Amino acid sequence: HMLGVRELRIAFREFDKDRDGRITVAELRQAAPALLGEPLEGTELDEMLREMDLNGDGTIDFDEFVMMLSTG
Ligand SMILES: [Ca+2]
Ligand SMILES: [Ca+2]
């Protein structure tokens, strides 16, 4: 059955509007506002983004998104 990637999927796949497997600051900004009806901030994003990356590329990959959440 599902070991736990379920949540990991629902989140990545959520902010992803192409199921391509990549949530660029763009997708995160198109999915982060709904979390609060309003876009928290701008530098607040790029900041968290820089922290959600493991290669500093500016994009989220399941391998990147997971490695982070998988342990947080
Ligand atoms: Ca995408
Ligand atoms: Ca990255």
What CATH number did the domain enclosing 11 receive?
1.10.238.10
Alpha carbon of 40 to ligand 2 centroid (Å)? 21
- Give dist(CA 3, CA 19) in Å, integer: 21
- Give dist(CA 62, CA 16) in Å, integer: 11
- Give dist(CA 34, CA 3) in Å, integer: 28
- Give dist(CA 4, CA 8) in Å, integer: 7
Domain that holds residue 30: 1-72
Number of other CB atoms surrounding residue 46 within 10 Å:
14
Alpha carbon of 26 to ligand 2 centroid (Å)? 13
Contact 25, 58 (CB under 8 A): yes
> Which technique was the structure solved with, according to the deposited record?
NMR
The β-bridge partners of 23 are 60
Chain centroid, CA 34 distance in Å = 13
Q: How many domains does the chain have?
A: 1
Burial of 28 (0-12, 13-18, 19+ CB in 10 A): buried
Q: Does residue 22 have a known ligand-binding role?
A: yes
Q: Does residue 51 have a known ligand-binding role?
A: no
The HSE-up count of residue 6 (CA atoms within 13 Å, CB side) is 4
Number of other CB atoms surrounding residue 27 within 10 Å:
19
